[PDB]
């Protein structure tokens, strides 16, 4: 009825816009075959599951249709402001025009591809049969087709698609085109007035529970009337229907009974993840807020904890409130939906190409002397210690480990310590590294609790149950972990870290946990010598409070000691005055390597897996005997640490094999190994100054 | 003032002291008592009243009890020729009472 549930007109017209879409897709110019035809075929040839739409190329579509008219209604501003409806509509726009056959379905190929095929096939034959029959009776030829199409029940399009549709919002060069849909936002920044819009946020992912099948539509089979019954399903729960809705089981005396078939129904991969404020964006007081996010279809598994990310999705509400007596009504409780993910600190080692990106590597390569260049380029913010950084580059790079074929492993990575006190700014290098390296995590002793590194068992909301949630070591693994105040960590912590240099392990036997989880972590540890600072009247290992069981594990211990020097401290003061005074430190002349492209280079570095020559091998051996013998002939105290246990040898092979990788190698030449020895001897021996 | 067994509202309860008022309070093995109790007995002897400030309830209950105690000398039967206060662990001021 009118005057109840009234009508209201709006600037928005979907009728023409659909047609506009159809003009955009399948007919296009910029990117002989036009982009969307061919791509959609590669979907129709069945090798490609997701279809990714961009608002950028839509921008260019309009500046083509603007000029060069006629005036075309604006898609984009209609898209951001609603964005839910357009997925489904855009979707039917696409469903019509596809390369039709397009090729054989083989055997596998795939399942759920064949079900689709047979559904489309039965879908055709029904029509063919009905028209064949009707024409027989009698008594331009379009009409009969129309009749047949409207008297017949068919598998709806939305049930048979096989593919998904996602949108990627525009930043960027296009924003200054000039032309909103992506303004990366804090979760504070989200007013509840944006509901429905397509928005882009930036924050840290946390939690992000396991992917499991959720069901969009359910199929039942009457078995009596035949047919099928598809119920669409929404929100959290549903009630399974019974009796029968079959048009043939309607109006009958006896309705048939139906029961579901999980092979027929349409499932989507569902994953939920929370994002917290980036913690910089938080206003001075208060606390970082949290926000929920859902993930369907292809985008699943793309997200992980301890990630700093730009998530772009159409933002929709879902019904809830607190205790029933706590609602005024109706509220919405909301959530964010996820169309497209863009991660800061892009994650190696996984990339295929190495297509024209090598170009982005080459500006760095060609100048030559990559190793010193990058070295200096780690944490330029501080002055001095080119050796320390020189090694930290290796730490970031790592490799190559090994597999003995039986097999057991030998790490595999580097473990760095930074000693000395109170100044010298040792920890700033660690904020530095944990900023540069992806999957890096910064922690402190009292600080990060023992339960901080180990994984607790806690009940998982929604999906169930009792999932192990770790932190520190587990949270950051396959990448560098960073520690400060490494002395004050007490005892139980030191046992964890003492064990993790067997790599590949923690073992939690307590209570509800028997698991042994895998931590592939690297460790860098900044520590202060016994109070107050490095008393030279005391032997080494006296002023280092740490046991020798642990230090044998560390391959490189950089002890940074401070003896006042009139000449150098001038240079330093000039540096720390120059910056502050300027933000950019190097001048006349060096070019600081941006962390992004740097991460790219290191990514391309980790791929190599070099191997040692015989000569360098023999050299390593002989030098190792000399190092053993010279370490032990030291015998009693001063000086030291002894004994130069085999982990220093393996350590220097591993450092060697690291330096090789920045040559990109496979050769592992003598100057490499020699260099490793250099770094080793330079590490210590600074206690003679 | 302690939460009640099963599910019930919070009831106040006295120690032996309050419960035994005008009567006779009988305690043994002082030496094994946790300080938390020791202060309570001391207070009771001192001002003849127990004050309770938790939770919202705030009072002074009145325990006038005579305390009779059994104590066990440190170690052996007679630990030393040394004085009683030296003989046993209990501090001299609580003993003076």
């Amino acid at each position: 009825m009118s005057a109840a549930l009234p009508s209201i007109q709006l600037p928005v017209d979907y009728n023409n816009l659909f047609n506009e879409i159809t003009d955009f897709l399948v007919t296009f110019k910029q990117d002989k075959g036009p982009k969307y035809m061919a791509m959609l075929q590669k979907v129709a040839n069945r090798e490609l599951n997701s279809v990714i739409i961009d608002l950028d190329d839509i921008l260019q579509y309009q500046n083509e249709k603007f000029l060069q008219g006629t005036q075309a209604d604006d898609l984009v501003s209609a898209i951001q402001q609603n964005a839910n409806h357009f997925t489904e509509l855009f979707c039917r726009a696409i469903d019509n025009n596809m390369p039709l056959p397009t090729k054989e379905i083989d055997y596998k190929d795939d399942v759920l591809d064949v079900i689709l095929n047979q559904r489309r096939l039965r879908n055709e034959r029904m029509l063919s049969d009905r028209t064949n029959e009707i024409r027989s009776e009698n008594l331009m030829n379009d009409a009969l087709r129309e009749v047949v199409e409207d008297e017949t029940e068919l598998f709806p399009p939305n049930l048979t698609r096989r593919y998904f549709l996602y949108f990627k919002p525009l930043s960027q060069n296009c924003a200054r085109r000039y032309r909103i849909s992506s303004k990366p936002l804090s979760v504070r920044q989200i007013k509840g007035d944006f509901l429905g819009q397509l928005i882009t946020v930036r924050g840290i992912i946390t939690r992000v529970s396991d992917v499991k099948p959720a069901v969009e539509v359910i199929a039942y089979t009457c078995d009596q009337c035949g047919y099928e019954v598809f119920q669409e399903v929404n929100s959290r729960t549903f009630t399974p229907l019974s009796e029968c809705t079959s048009e043939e089981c309607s109006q009958n005396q006896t309705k048939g009974q139906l029961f579901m078939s999980t092979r027929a129904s349409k499932f989507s991969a569902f994953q939920e993840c929370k994002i917290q404020e980036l913690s910089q964006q938080v206003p001075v007081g208060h606390i970082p807020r949290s926000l929920n996010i859902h993930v369907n279809g292809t985008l699943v598994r793309s997200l992980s904890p301890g990630d700093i990310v730009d998530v772009t999705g159409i933002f929709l509400p879902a019904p809830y409130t607190g205790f029933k007596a706590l609602k005024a009504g109706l509220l919405t409780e909301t959530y964010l939906e996820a169309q497209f993910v863009r991660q800061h600190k892009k994650k190696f080692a996984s990339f295929s190409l190495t297509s024209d990106v090598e170009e982005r590597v080459m500006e760095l390569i060609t100048s030559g002397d990559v190793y010193n260049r990058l070295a200096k380029s780690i944490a330029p913010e501080i002055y001095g210690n080119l050796d320390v950084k020189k090694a930290l580059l290796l730490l970031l790079v790592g490799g190559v480990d090994k597999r003995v074929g039986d097999g057991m492993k030998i790490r595999g990575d580097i473990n760095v310590c930074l000693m000395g006190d109170p100044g010298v700014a040792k920890s700033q290098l660690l904020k530095a590294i944990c900023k540069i390296s992806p999957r890096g995590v910064y922690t402190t002793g009292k600080g990060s609790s023992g339960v901080g590194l180990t994984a607790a068992v806690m009940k998982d909301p929604v999906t169930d149950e009792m999932i192990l949630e770790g932190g520190a070591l587990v949270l950051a693994d396959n990448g560098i972990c960073c520690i400060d105040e490494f002395d004050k960590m007490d005892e139980s912590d030191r046992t964890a870290i003492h064990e993790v240099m067997e790599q590949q392990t923690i073992s939690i036997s307590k209570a509800g946990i028997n698991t042994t989880l895998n931590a592939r972590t690297s460790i860098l540890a900044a520590a202060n010598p016994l109070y107050g600072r490095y008393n030279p009247r005391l032997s080494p290992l006296d002023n280092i409070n740490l046991p020798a069981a642990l230090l044998s594990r560390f391959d490189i211990l950089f002890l940074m000691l401070d003896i006042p020097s009139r000449d150098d401290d001038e240079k330093l003061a000039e540096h720390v005055t120059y910056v502050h005074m300027h933000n950019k430190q190097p001048d006349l002349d060096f070019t600081p390597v941006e962390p992004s492209k740097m991460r790219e280079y290191i990514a391309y570095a980790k791929t190599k897996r070099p191997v040692m020559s015989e000569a360098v091998n023999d050299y390593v051996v002989q030098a190792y005997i000399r190092l053993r013998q010279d370490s032990k002939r030291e015998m009693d105290s001063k000086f030291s640490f002894g004994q130069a246990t085999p982990r220093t040898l393996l350590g220097i092979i591993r450092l060697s094999q690291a330096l090789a990788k920045l040559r990109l190698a496979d050769m592992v030449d003598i100057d490499d190994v020699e260099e490793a020895l250099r770094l080793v001897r330079v590490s210590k021996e600074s206690l003679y100054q | 003032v302690r939460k009640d067994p099963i599910t019930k509202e919070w009831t106040l309860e006295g120690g032996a002291l309050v419960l035994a008022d005008k009567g006779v309070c009988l305690i043994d093995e002082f030496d094994k008592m946790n300080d938390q109790d020791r202060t309570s007995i001391h207070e009771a002897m001192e001002q003849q009243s127990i004050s309770i400030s938790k939770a919202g309830i705030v009072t002074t209950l009145q325990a006038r009890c005579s305390i009779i105690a059994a104590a066990n000398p440190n170690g052996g039967r007679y630990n030393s020729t040394l004085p009683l206060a030296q003989n046993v662990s209990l501090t001299e001021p609580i003993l003076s009472r």
Binding site: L5, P6, S7, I8, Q9, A83, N84, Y178, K191, G192, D193, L195, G196, Q197, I204, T206, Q276, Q280, V282, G285, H286, I287, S290, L316, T321, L326, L330, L331, T332, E333, P422, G423, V424, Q428, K431, A432, Y442, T443, G447, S448, G452, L453, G471, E485, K488, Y531, G532, D562, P564, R566, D569, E570, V576, T577, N583, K584, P595 | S53, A55, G56
Partner: protein, 605 residues
């Protein structure tokens, strides 16, 4: 037409014309809002080619203007407020009529009878406009609330509409109509709902406890919740001290309705929700400098000797210690803050320690630090638990979501933390203070919520000498008692002696006497403008000075005394910049450098 206009309402609107017309101050105020939106509406459209609508109304006015309308609002908010709002909406529609909503009132006051605290409340005060103050806890999670609906309908095109009236809409009661959620339009076409067309308004409800300082000696606290909508949402965090003014409602049926003990849930609507300051909590400087004050500063900035006068203005009751007072100012200002591009930030603020025999006023000084400090929280010895930490509070609160409850150092962000008996504090904490001070951030991995949250606080600490009075004669080390890096973290270590002399004694006596028988007020006002305006940057006038100085310190003092590192240098720069702020100078200067030199000297010698 609704129920059609009634001369009750008619009179109540019409009578509220002359006021606001007199006092006219509001009539243009509304205009101003319009203006501010217009300009910004011009900013989104052209440049790439907002404000809340409520306007405060003093209750002071009505008394002169209308007695009955006063007494009426206070006594019957339900009947007088919505027509007033109607009027102001009409006016706001008049001001700029051409280009193309509630427009609520604040009700400041001039309270009140009706001034009452949440301890003493109801049932005489029930359904009247109340002013209730206190701690805000536990707050609540913000949820958007659905008001209008929109739907698309194929094949007939069109669209639709719907409205939703909550129990809390308007003020006065109304015969409730549930609208369902319209779907399945008749005729039987389906309806695909649409978003972004359908409006929402945010919703939040915060509970208010009675003031803990104004609390009774001891008893359980008793709190009353408050509902806040749209513009009022999220203004206050839990832990702030807040004066809430608003209607007090009986809303709901109390069991009388369903026939088959407790009754009539009650809560406060809106309305003003002022955040305010009380010692150790919740900002609030604020402050209002008007026309004249800022001029006073501007005049006073040029005078060359001002720094010494200022430094004397802190201590009406305390002798000497001019150097230390100088220090406390130089903490109040604090070297700007500098966050490098794609790199770590250098610490801006300056931290201070005081060590000397008792009676040194060390514990007396700090309270006066606290008062004029503009924040922050005080902490004394132990102290703790967690100090600055969120403690990662288990469990739930509510429904099972794990959330953080901010400790001191977090809550004290951008402020002055005091620490008394700084030595007594357990080493376990100190370990964390290292992370707080220099690094400038706090990190919580506990169970748990795993986050790095920012506490950038400035810090003072007063700590007794090791054993007895021995501080004076005792060695440059072994005297401090709290090695080691801590000694460095503190930018300035000041030592004060209680050693006695007869002359100095007399000079003590008289001032002590007179005491029992540059004004502090203008001090903090002098300070805030100085703080946000303007940061002096850095200049090549000075650098060579602090470099000379620094190198001197290392080279000579490492023979003299200890500790000295790059840290000292950082401190030099912070002090220079701070004294620049005192000078209001847009630049750093050499003189300033010399000053920093001086105080760091008296620190050392």
């Amino acid at each position: 037409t609704f129920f059609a206009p009634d001369a009750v309402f008619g009179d109540r609107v019409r009578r509220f014309q002359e006021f606001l017309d007199t006092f006219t101050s509001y009539r243009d105020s509304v205009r101003s809002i319009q203006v501010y939106n217009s300009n910004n509406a011009a900013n989104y459209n052209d440049d790439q080619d907002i404000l809340p609508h409520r306007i405060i109304i003093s209750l002071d006015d009505l008394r002169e203007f209308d007695r009955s309308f006063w007494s009426g609002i206070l006594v019957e908010p339900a009947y007088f407020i919505p027509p007033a709002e109607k009027a102001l909406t009409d006016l706001a529609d008049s001001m700029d009529d051409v280009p193309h909503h509630p427009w609520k009132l604040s009700f400041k006051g001039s309270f009140g009878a009706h001034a009452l605290s949440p301890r003493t409340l109801t049932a005489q005060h029930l359904n009247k406009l109340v002013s209730v103050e206190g701690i805000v806890t536990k707050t609540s999670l913000v949820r958007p609330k659905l008001i209008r609906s929109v739907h698309y309908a194929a094949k007939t095109g069109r669209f639709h509409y719907r409205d939703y009236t909550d129990a809390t809409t308007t003020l006065t009661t109304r015969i409730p109509t549930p609208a369902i959620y319209p779907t399945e339009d008749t005729e039987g076409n389906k309806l695909t709902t649409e978003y972004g067309y359908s409006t929402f308004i945010d919703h939040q409800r915060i509970t208010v406890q009675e003031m803990p300082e104004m609390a009774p000696a001891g008893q359980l606290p008793r709190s009353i919740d408050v509902i806040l909508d749209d513009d009022l949402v999220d203004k206050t965090k839990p832990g702030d001290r807040v004066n809430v003014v608003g209607v007090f409602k009986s809303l709901g049926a109390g069991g009388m309705n369903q026939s088959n003990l407790i009754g009539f849930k009650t809560l406060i609507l809106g309305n003003t929700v002022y955040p305010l300051h009380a010692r150790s909590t919740g900002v609030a400087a604020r402050q209002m400098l008007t026309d004249f004050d800022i001029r006073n500063i501007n005049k006073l900035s040029k005078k060359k000797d001002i720094f010494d006068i200022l430094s004397q203005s802190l201590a009406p009751s305390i002798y000497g210690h001019d150097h230390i007072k100088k220090a406390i100012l130089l903490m109040l200002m604090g070297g700007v803050e500098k966050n490098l591009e794609n790199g770590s930030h250098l610490r801006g603020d300056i931290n201070i320690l005081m060590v000397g025999d008792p009676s040194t006023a060390k514990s007396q000084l700090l309270r006066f630090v606290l008062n004029t400090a503009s924040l922050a929280i005080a902490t004394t010895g132990r102290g703790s638990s967690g100090v600055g930490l969120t403690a990662a509070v288990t469990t739930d609160r509510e429904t099972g979501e794990r959330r953080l409850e901010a400790g001191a150092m977090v809550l004290a962000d951008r402020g002055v933390v005091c620490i008394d008996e700084f030595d007594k504090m357990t080493d376990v904490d100190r370990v964390a203070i290292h992370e707080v001070m220099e690094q400038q951030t706090v990190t919580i991995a506990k169970a748990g919520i795993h986050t790095t949250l920012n506490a950038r606080c400035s810090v003072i600490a007063a700590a007794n000498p090791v054993f007895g009075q021995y501080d004076v004669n005792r060695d440059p080390h072994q005297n401090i008692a709290l090695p080691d890096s801590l000694l460095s973290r503190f930018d300035l270590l000041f030592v004060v002696t209680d050693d006695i002399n007869e002359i100095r004694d007399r000079s003590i006596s008289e001032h002590v006497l007179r005491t029992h028988r540059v004004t502090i007020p203008f001090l903090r006002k002098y300070v805030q403008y100085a703080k946000e305006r303007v940061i002096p940057q850095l200049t090549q006038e000075a650098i060579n000075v602090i470099v000379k100085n620094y190198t001197d310190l290392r080279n000579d003092d490492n023979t003299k005394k200890s500790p000295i590192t790059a840290r000292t240098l950082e401190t030099l720069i912070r002090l220079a910049t701070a004294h620049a702020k005192v000078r209001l100078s847009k630049t750093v200067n050499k003189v300033d450098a010399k000053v920093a030199a001086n105080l760091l000297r008296f620190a050392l010698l």
